[PDB]
Design a protein around this nucleic acid. Structure first.
Lengths: 91, 69, 104, 93, 81, 81, 106, 94
DNA sequence: GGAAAACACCCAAGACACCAGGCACGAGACAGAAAAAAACAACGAAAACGGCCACCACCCAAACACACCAAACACAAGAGCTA
DNA sequence: CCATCTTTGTGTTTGGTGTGTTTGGGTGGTGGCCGTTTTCGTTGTTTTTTTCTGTCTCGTGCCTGGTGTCTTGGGTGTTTTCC
């Protein structure tokens, strides 16, 4: 439990990206391939995608933590994920 | 509801006449907003293994919706 | 000679006037609109830079970092209310732990 | 090439409010994006107001009402006061 | 007009909650619903009022209300939009 | 490329949850999180690639991705605009 | 005989009216010729789909009068139409009947 | 000063798709508002997207791309196909 | 070429889920109370239209200085080790 | 966590120019102003109506305590795959 609070304090005080660059790059290229082939990519576009996806996932995890807190629990569950997504309006 | 709308509008600048269509549009928008909020609050109550909605679910729904900071 | 010096502003009134004219918003633009817009932009940027400098001073730093800008934006009710749907690159998140999660 | 930026003016207002404080290039880009976004919002809403009242001219009034429409709370009031003071200072010079 | 926030009566807000599929209603929720309704009405009324004041008019029309609502991402169909 | 979404490692999801202040994590969270990330990435990439296709370009630039997230209400500061 | 552009393109929507509104709606100095035709065709398709689903939903209700209730039913019961018209409230449209599964007694 | 409206065309397409069904004046108002809102959305997106590429013309390409950007799913594909059919039908006549 | 970090494996500890019990608090119905709603008339603030009249912004043309690029040297605080 | 010797790479300043902002005068019309009409918004009065308010009884849904187990968390050594 102690190292959980240590990780929370460390990552909430840090500013570097937590998603690894090369797997995310390969994921973006794999996703973009099925819309159009022979696609090139600027590095800054990939970095912008990474930053936006990280911000969105952090916000989703915060709302999910609130949902988990509501049900008198401390552990987040998938039902919290779809509750947050349903209330926020994603389908 | 018309008196309530006039009470809210009085606080900025008086002598403000309110057409019937504006009052009807305000009523329709308020009812739609309240129905959506109650649907979200019912989802919140169902998530917490309850069938009765509480004000804490209202506050949480507003928080996650972004209306409340 | 410059409209900025006549209006007592540092932002370029002529640049705002040119952007409004060639921005396809309306046919004609009054003389007071770019002055008003430049004053609003200067006041808003002065406010956010003041809060960023205060946050940098509190963090014992001399150069403003986007972390400091994120802290300044998120610690202000009016600014974060205005900028709710904005995500700052390399800004991180505001440090906040819930009351009930702290250990016992 | 010739890319426009708000760097010099942000530097001037920064040294006005904090003479001894610097700023990074990424923060400079962030400030440029912020100024451009706020400019776009205010100018577009002012154009929308001009379209509503069947008017072809953007004056200080529609800009002022757009400022009250967008900025929330005390912010909008102080911005309106500052803009009004700038307008009369320009008109009296 | 003096404190007519109580005009949103308890059966009416019960009906509004009932349309949303809610089975049981807590006794303390009514003040919260009145507060959030007041907040929403306050925001929309404020925006409609400054829309009317820009138009040099003394009467708020439906067009200002629909404009204000659509500007808040709450677009309303059926009132001349 | 085949089955590459699993490259988003489990400690990476752990770190992202730690940034959000989450103390305990269930084992089924990771696959759902991967699905959510895939949906979000697909939604952004569709608009970005449409913007590139209209401009007769063969490379995705940062400006298109910014414009596309802004069109989704996810405005990004720091990469132009 | 000066034939209308709607009759030339086989459309029911007015090509001239949408062309005038595009030219007068402060977008760009000049407007291409195919843009009003394309926009009118898209508007035609969308109103045809909406009116079709609304007429069908009225037909299940044994009614010959299209009301806002049938329009709300047609919009909310179609996934892509609900996605497109997500943030709009239909006046006098009501709410779709939806009761939760665990809300019901046993 | 007769305010223009889309009432006659909406009634024409309804009579085309449902010969035995009528429509209330309120539903006509909702349909008019819907058509107007879709018009403003597509026109504004096309104008912006044209402004991005430093272009002065809204053509069929800009409207098509705006339709692909806005309409979700099969609706976009069907609208694009029918719009292209309308454009080539207009181009084939004079 | 390089090195930091995911990953499999093995122990442990503690929060979630279920059961049981109790309490209290909205729900339901009858009776009494309220005032909302509809019809109807009067007064008049004010909105839409029209006609006039002028100051304000667009357009061409000439001019010069602020803001850009190139290029230079400075110095904030990041690297590791101390306390 | 802050602090100091030493590094460095990126912030800050400075010269030249070209392009963009500034001055001058002329025209045409958008918009301010006034005046008239007349639609509609408010304010006031009466009856039927139907809902709202209050009170009494009580069924069951919300909250709390106990067990245990299984689910996740922590530590370690390695290969590998990201930089």
């Amino acid at each position: 439990g102690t190292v959980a609070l240590r990780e929370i304090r460390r990552y909430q005080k840090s500013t570097e990206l937590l998603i690894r660059k090369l797997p995310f790059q390969r994921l973006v290229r794999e996703i973009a391939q099925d819309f159009k082939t022979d696609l090139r990519f600027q590095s800054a576009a990939i970095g912008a995608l990474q930053e936006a996806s990280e911000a969105y996932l952090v916000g989703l995890f915060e709302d999910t933590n609130l949902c988990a807190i509501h049900a008198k629990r401390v552990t987040i569950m998938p039902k919290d994920i779809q509750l947050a997504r349903r209330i926020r309006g994603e389908r | 509801f018309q008196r309530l709308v006039r009470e809210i509008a009085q606080d900025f600048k008086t002598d403000l006449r309110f057409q019937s269509a504006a009052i009807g549009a305000l009523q329709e928008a308020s009812e739609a907003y309240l129905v959506g909020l109650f649907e979200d609050t019912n989802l919140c109550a169902i998530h917490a293994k309850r069938v009765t909605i509480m004000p804490k679910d209202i506050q949480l729904a507003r928080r996650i919706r972004g209306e409340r900071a | 000679k410059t409209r900025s010096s006549r209006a007592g502003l540092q932002f370029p009134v002529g640049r705002v006037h040119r952007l409004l004219r060639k921005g396809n918003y309306s046919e004609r633009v009054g003389a007071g609109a770019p002055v008003y817009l430049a004053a609003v932009l200067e006041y808003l940027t002065a406010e956010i830079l003041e809060l960023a400098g205060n946050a940098a001073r509190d963090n014992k730093k001399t150069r403003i970092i986007p972390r400091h800008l994120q802290l300044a934006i998120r610690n202000d009710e009016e600014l974060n209310k205005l900028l709710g749907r904005v995500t700052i690159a390399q800004g991180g998140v505001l440090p906040n732990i819930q009351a009930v999660l702290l250990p016992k | 090439s010739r890319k426009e930026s708000y760097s010099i003016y942000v530097y001037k207002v920064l040294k006005q409010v904090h003479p001894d404080t610097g700023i990074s290039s990424k923060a400079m880009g962030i400030m440029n994006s912020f100024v451009n976004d706020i400019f776009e919002r205010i100018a577009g809403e002012a154009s929308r107001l001009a379209h509503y009242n069947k008017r072809s001219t953007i004056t200080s009034r529609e800009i002022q009402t757009a400022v009250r429409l967008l900025l929330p709370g005390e912010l909008a009031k102080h911005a309106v006061s500052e803009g009004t003071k700038a307008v009369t200072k320009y008109t009296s010079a | 007009l003096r404190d007519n926030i109580q005009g949103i009566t308890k059966p009416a807000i019960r009906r509004l909650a009932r349309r949303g599929g809610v089975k049981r209603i807590s006794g303390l929720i009514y003040e919260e619903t009145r507060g959030v309704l007041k907040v929403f009405l306050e925001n929309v009324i404020r925006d409609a009022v400054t829309y009317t004041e820009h138009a040099k008019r003394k009467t708020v029309t439906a067009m200002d209300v629909v404009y204000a609502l659509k500007r808040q991402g709450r677009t309303l169909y059926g009132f001349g939009g």
